[PDB]
Amino acid sequence: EYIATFKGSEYFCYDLSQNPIQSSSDEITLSFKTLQRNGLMLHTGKSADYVNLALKNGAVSLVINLGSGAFEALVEPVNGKFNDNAWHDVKVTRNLRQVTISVDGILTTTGYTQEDYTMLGSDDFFYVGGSPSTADLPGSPVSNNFMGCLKEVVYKNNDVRLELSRLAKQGDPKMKIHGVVAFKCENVATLDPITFETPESFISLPKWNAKKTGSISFDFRTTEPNGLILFSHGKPRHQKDAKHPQMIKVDFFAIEMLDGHLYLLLDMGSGTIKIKALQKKVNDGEWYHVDFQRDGRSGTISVNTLRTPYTAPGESEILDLDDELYLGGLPENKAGLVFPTEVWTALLNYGYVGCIRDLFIDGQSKDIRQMAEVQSTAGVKPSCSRETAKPCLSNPCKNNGMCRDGWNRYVCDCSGTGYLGRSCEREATVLSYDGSMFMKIQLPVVMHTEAEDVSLRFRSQRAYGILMATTSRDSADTLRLELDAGRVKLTVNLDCIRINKGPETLFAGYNLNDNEWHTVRVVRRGKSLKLTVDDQQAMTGQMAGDHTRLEFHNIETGIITERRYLSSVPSNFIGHLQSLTFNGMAYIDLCKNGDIDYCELNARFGFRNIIADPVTFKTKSSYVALATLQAYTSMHLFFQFKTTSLDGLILYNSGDGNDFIVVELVKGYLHYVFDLGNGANLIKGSSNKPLNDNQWHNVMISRDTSNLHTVKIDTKITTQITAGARNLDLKSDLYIGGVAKETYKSLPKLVHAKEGFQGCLASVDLNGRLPDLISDALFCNGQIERGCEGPSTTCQEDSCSNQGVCLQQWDGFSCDCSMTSFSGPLCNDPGTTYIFSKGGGQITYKWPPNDRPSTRADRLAIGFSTVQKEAVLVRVDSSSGLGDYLELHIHQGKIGVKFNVGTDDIAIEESNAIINDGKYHVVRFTRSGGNATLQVDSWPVIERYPAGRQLTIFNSQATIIIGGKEQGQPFQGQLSGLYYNGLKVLNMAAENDANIAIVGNVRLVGEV
Ligand SMILES: *[C@@H]1O[C@H](CO)[C@@H](O[C@@H]2O[C@H](CO)[C@@H](O)[C@H](O)[C@H]2NC(C)=O)[C@H](O)[C@H]1NC(C)=O
């Protein structure tokens, strides 16, 4: 008996080229044992002549071509199945073009080979149990090597009797046993199926060694609408993109789910191909069989049997994958890994979750419940179960998060809620923006995408302003969300090439400037845009020009800082944001918690009511004039004021004819007066009290395209509707906070004002533009002063407190403490003090070899107390081989300094002042080349001007040594607040600066 266990990845191989089979008669016998539904038992020959016998989804297939039109048979499972693990028999006989296939010896089928050929000629190879590629050999219906046991295999023809089961065992120099081996039976088989529990979970796979041809099959099961199943790329091509030379192009293929839809992706070196693998959505939570067969340019993709044609563009046949292939998602931060833009799910971090079994690569079963399964993958499990409890009953999403019933898990969509995290349990961080702050995520490498999900929540009082924006250093491409006249406006600009579009936009929402929070969600899939504010109905648009790919280097909020190529941009935001989410990154939170280091900003975290760049008008009569209001089609004004005065003109701008617009305070109440060609109207803003109670008020005044005017004061809307009128430009400059003295005597009809505004304006928004009231003024009158808090503090005789130097800044004075021996903002706190006690000590600063200073002017100050008569406090030496040094010492109870910059030594000594005394003294030394000066405490400055040839550079400074041990005169007392050319040497030492060594008896003091 000749029985042999076919391991799966093993097969027999006979060489017929020394004695060709070619025959008119012939006959084929064997018994088979298999659990599996497909597998090649055997095959011989190439082109037009072959004979091919194998199990095809549970039935015995047989193909014969004698040279001109095959005979195909597929004998059926009558009473039970063939994949039963029991023995079954095959007899195949053939007389000329006549074929009979017998099963177990009684399930016959008869037919003919086509046309007139009768000669089966094959001089290549005779395969048993599998092959180098099964989906290739001619007439194959399967693509699978055999798993299980084969018995008593024989091909008798009229001439020779190739008895293959026997010749393989007894050993023949014409029989090649390619891979594995195994020669008994009663040996069983099967391989486990697998569950990928989490998105991020993935299995790493052995290189698909494709080429011209390759095939793949596996089974899947899930209720997850989106996810990346299989993916693999080649090596980076020298053939660049025209538009994106920055974008790494590679050969590849992927299989992917996207909204329950199955998808195949191939790129072989010229253009991609996307294929709906099946019409119906496949996230049925039902098993599906997936064959993928490819042959150079063409191939088919098969779902439960239903095959779909493809041909990839261009003439590239080879699909050149190299190295690792991936199943169920991608790793994070594998360098070398390149995500091609065409593959949506890779770039949206939708790793697959669900079940996968029975994997075959080029015909060969790879078992997975081992793969990197027993090889330490996290979030993958042995068997595959479907938890009948619907997990969103678990009731798991907090705070009105939306719950999605997943695979074996629920998912939360926290986007609209102010929370994040698996269960919306984490409060989401708020960034707050006052019109001159930004928060900019600089991606660590450059993104290229064809598809996004972006959401964010904002609130603002302003009808305009940027929400979020992606930007490139290399072009003006951008995906951007912004407030535009109260609506949210999505803009998707993709830029040029071809020449010898416009922007594409959506709008959603109205009046979102109410200072309540709104959620905005953008989905892009290629040319499709979908935008949607809050719960309202989604607004959709198809983009038109056939570019889809978007390059970005940053995601920007607040200010658009990267705008090299735009001479103009949406205006800076003022309000708050929260829950920025961009292909699932929560950048605001990541940034705040420091989970990412590439986030850069000057927004402030946490919410606060904003007053944005407040400006003071000191006297009524002070006013500025700005360039003309630009209310084209609609108008949205906003500002805040704070005043103690009952009446003044606040905003005036006039037009052609009787046209004008005014905003004024009258007897405490706010009045918006205007005439747009139908005569003057007054609308009184609504409040019970006078508004000059020295608090900030918000004022918001707007005319829309229906001519509905609205005046809002703090929380109170007043609306009125006025006459339909060709809306016309204004003409005069735009005056704020008064007008020229002479003008009030002739302002329009119902304008009360005879005097300007006194008080503060802030957050001034003129129909989309945030002027800097002081800086953008065209001219000015009287005093407009920055801030809302009177003037900056200015320097006084007594301002700094230890001979600190008082310097003026724009926001009040500072004290330069450098030459005092002190610290703190008024030079009044003790400088960093070290106590040098008995037996000596030493703090050394050592410059790193290349930052060795070489100066023409030095200055050094330090504070000290000591009883000593002889001591070296501090010394600075040049590096090994040069003369130059500077040394502050106490010789004969008197403080002094000695230095050499390449000529003579120069001494300078405070001769008269007691300093070894026990009391605190400070000494300040300066030097300019040859000349130097010395001063202690309050003693007149001592100046030294050498005559003759002085060199001037203290060359290559290498160490500052404090303490005296080197120069053998240890210091003993207290050294405090030493400053040398910019270095605060003791602050440095008290902070473990790596270039500081401390040795010996020397202690850092406490503070108060
Ligand atoms: C060292 O000190 C002297 C003395 O004041 C400086 O020499 C004078 O420089 C001034 C301009 O500041 C000239 O008008 C004089 O002609 C110079 N007088 C002398 C005595 O030469 C000198 O420049 C200082 N040198 C350095 C390098 O700081």
UniProtKB/Swiss-Prot annotation:
GO terms assigned for molecular function: metal ion binding; neuroligin family protein binding
Main location: membrane
Disulfide bonds: C149-C185, C355-C384, C392-C403, C397-C412, C414-C424, C591-C599, C760-C788, C795-C806, C800-C815, C817-C827
Topological category with respect to the lipid bilayer: Single-pass type I membrane protein
Keywords recorded for this protein, A-Z: Calcium, Cell adhesion, Cell membrane, Cell projection, Disulfide bond, EGF-like domain, Glycoprotein, Heparan sulfate, Membrane, Metal-binding, Proteoglycan, Repeat, Signal, Synapse, Transmembrane, Transmembrane helix
Topological domains annotated Extracellular: 1-1008
Residue intervals of the Laminin G-like domain: 3-185, 192-384, 430-599, 613-788, 834-1002
Organism superkingdom: Eukaryota
Record's subcellular location: Presynaptic cell membrane
Family: Belongs to the neurexin family.
Protein known as: Neurexin-1
Species: Bos taurus (Bovine)
Lineage: Eukaryota, Metazoa, Chordata, Craniata, Vertebrata
Included range, full protein: 297 to 1353 of 1530
